[PDB]
Symmetry: D2
Subunit: 251 residues, 4 copies
């Protein structure tokens, strides 16, 4: 308990599923949290469901929106004081092979999944370096950052990019003594309402040729590894990849 004492976290895509579980456990461990999402309806309800505005607030933002990133860091500092912790969790999927990806689909997915993580990482380093915060940037980088999927071409590109860009940022922050760590988290298949809304999706993901455990994960599985990485417990972990996938990548 109090594993995130004094921390101030931004969690992009924090209004549902994995992001909301990360936000929930972060508040339970003593962090102040600003969650982001595209929809005020979802986001204001989500913040209130977790805690008071002294614990957690919502900021409406598309991660692809560069100017919005400045507003987001300014709003979080105004509410909670200097930001110590950034979880770049916002992402979209296109269910196309490379061959069948349109240029419009390619640009839209990279704008959220890659540009957004770049904008957040770049700004996070500038705003959180050299303040003795034990600062931590956690980039969501998928099992699709390790292995290909024939029907997730653009998503694979974005997650590979996040995986190695995060190492670059980890190294620069370490070498310059910035007191900022950067790591990637790689979820396998996770049961969310969105999976539950697609008939047969969980059953397909639970086949042993996909997930050896024969079931898929829950959002708290990703929340717990994020608490470790945001905490000072992980002060020697930087430039690392943390996989939580039911054995998906082990075979």
């Amino acid at each position: 308990s109090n594993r995130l004492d004094g921390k101030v976290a931004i969690i992009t895509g924090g209004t549902l599923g994995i992001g909301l579980a990360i936000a929930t456990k972060f508040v339970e461990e003593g962090a102040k949290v600003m969650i982001t999402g595209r929809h005020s309806d979802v986001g204001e309800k989500a913040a209130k469901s977790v805690g008071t505005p002294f614990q957690i607030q919502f900021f409406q933002h598309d991660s692809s929106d560069e100017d919005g990133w400045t507003k987001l860091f300014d709003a979080t500092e105004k509410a909670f004081g200097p930001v110590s912790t950034l979880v770049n969790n916002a992402g979209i999927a296109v269910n196309k092979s490379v061959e069948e990806t349109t240029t419009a689909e390619w640009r839209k997915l990279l704008a959220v999944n890659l540009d957004g993580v770049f904008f957040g990482t770049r700004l996070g380093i500038q705003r959180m370096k050299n303040k003795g915060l034990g600062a931590s940037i956690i980039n969501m980088s998928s099992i699709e950052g390790f292995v290909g999927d024939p029907s997730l071409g653009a998503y694979n590109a974005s997650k590979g990019a996040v995986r190695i860009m995060s190492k670059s940022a980890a190294l620069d922050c370490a070498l310059k003594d910035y007191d900022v760590r950067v790591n990637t988290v790689h979820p396998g298949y996770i049961k969310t309402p969105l999976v539950d809304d697609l008939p047969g999706a969980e059953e397909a993901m639970s086949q042993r040729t996909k997930t050896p455990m024969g079931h898929i994960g829950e959002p708290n599985d990703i929340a717990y590894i994020c608490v470790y990485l945001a905490s000072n417990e992980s002060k020697f972990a930087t430039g690392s990849e943390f996989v939580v996938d039911g054995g998906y990548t082990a075979q």
Copy 2:
């Protein structure tokens, strides 16, 4: 707090350095612990330094000793009840290139670092499967399981072996619904009394071309990732590698 409620852990090489830190944090999180080591003098003192014999005990054992593994699981069950958690941390180093490794050095190091982890993993699966324990085997597998070191040839062999053997065991346990997870932890350079006893060793390990953070870790850095992996917080993590190395492998 109470993150290892009800757990019963064996930690090999648990009498000093990283193993002792893992044992200390495991007891602090509510686990019963049996630590092993070659020397009764070190081991009985270490157990008493951490807690009462109702919390932690010592069992004298060389991990290379196959028959001793049976005695160790029997003694732990007699003291604390069924074992839920095994940390295979016992290991030795030979400071020779492959070229300059004698056959006697090769066999001695593999007996501890590889045979020992095999004997512990094999027995752990048999003893901890199908009991609803949330069982977890944590194999120590080094940054030397990912990258070569020209003067650690046999050690590199042993750590590569542990890395991939652990995936095999993770997959079999997952596919057979055994309720046993197997993961590897990969420390970079860690400050211990043994490092402190070698003049200039910490300074060499802290050079940026080795450890980008410009310093080395402390035993608690490895203890915290082991608490996560032993706990039910990591119930969807199996067959994964967890690196805590100050950026060593990121460059």
Copy 3:
């Protein structure tokens, strides 16, 4: 000899350095080659230096230019018949950390290094599937696709993207029986006239803490692995990463 009998290859950035060496060895092994580059002065001289217009031609192209990719495949087919082989070699570097990367630098580098490899791979699959050509797409994906560099943030993002996007494409082509393979090549540091023009670059690259061989490579080092991947010798290799780096990533 004749290891690329009947092959028709496009090599982007084929007018200089690594691309020119690949083109030279491809023509030697019996391939017909279209090389691309931004500058017709360089490109027309380069094609004539290697062979006759029945062996090798130049097509002026920026790999970021989507419409130009269509014209490039059309021109290659007109000159040499159906394309069997694509080497996505064109690339640029920005020598900035993630922190210091401007948005204009980010967008410019991703346009060439990521968008261009996507446009080439997508069009390559569409044009070379189901023609019994033994088709092969070779993506240049850098050692910077495996490890971070603190001063190559955008470059690392682009090379990690190419690494995993290529696996996606490899799998879709294999599962659909397209007779198209996709693989990545990961050069370490290679001596080119351009490296010769950067004072101290080769010397810095040649430090044992960077390249263990204590020297950097030459363009033919990359040409020879590309001949293997373009040829039918590699008909069971798809979704693989081929590193030629002097030991850079082994430590």
Copy 4:
């Protein structure tokens, strides 16, 4: 043609399947070859099938036999002159999970697959260093060196060991300017008479959930990457992993 001009190669387990194909292509490319195997009936027939005793000979040897390794290098030097090239191909498999592996099975498999590769690599470095031979050690390290298989526990241990031990040897040889390269080759599933003798093996290996190409490879698939690694074409490749697996590890 003549890609292995002047080379003198030892190929362990060179009398059947993959080893025999490597030997066949090595002789075709101008190498002198000593093949090893346990059975003189098979070995003498295999050598005569490929070439004359001035091109290729057989030496009876179990790779687990340390004293026999000395006699093998002595016999090869006597027949062909100084050895330039070693392919550590000899291997055995036990079809047991870690849980089900007997100690006798463990020790027997490690004696061949790990001890034998150590004995060969160590002796190879000692005999081929500092002779200007362009020396090359190629270690067979399996897709089972990258991913687990629930029913290949000891095999996975041995192949992970070879993978990382080879990086250690590569680095020491590079740093000491020995003119010795060390690399690993990782075959996927390969059709051999031995696979043909296991009912349903090829069919199981050919499922898209195992090999995405929907078929397995042939021995020449491994021979061609070994020619590249033995030749001076690969003079900048050391400490690298070369996977030829039909897409097995890409998903």
